[PDB]
Amino acid sequence: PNYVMHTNDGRSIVTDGKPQTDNDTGMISYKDANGNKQQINRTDVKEMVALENLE
Numbered sequence: 303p304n305y306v307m308h309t310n311d312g313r314s315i316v317t318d319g320k321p322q323t324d325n326d327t328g329m330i331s332y333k334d335a336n337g338n339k340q341q342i343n344r345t346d347v348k349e350m351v352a353l354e355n356l357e
Contacts, residue, residue, distance in 0.1 A: 304316065305351060308337075308348045309347060309348065311346060316335050
């Protein structure tokens, strides 16, 4: 259930698992390619493209 988030500042961020709204901040919480939690404003996320599970 990985994704490639296309930001509005010209970035393509790969995620580990499906991101989701942070219960505390309202920001979008996601796990980077290193398994580290990160937060990005939904406003800066244009779209999320699903990556096929290749195992």
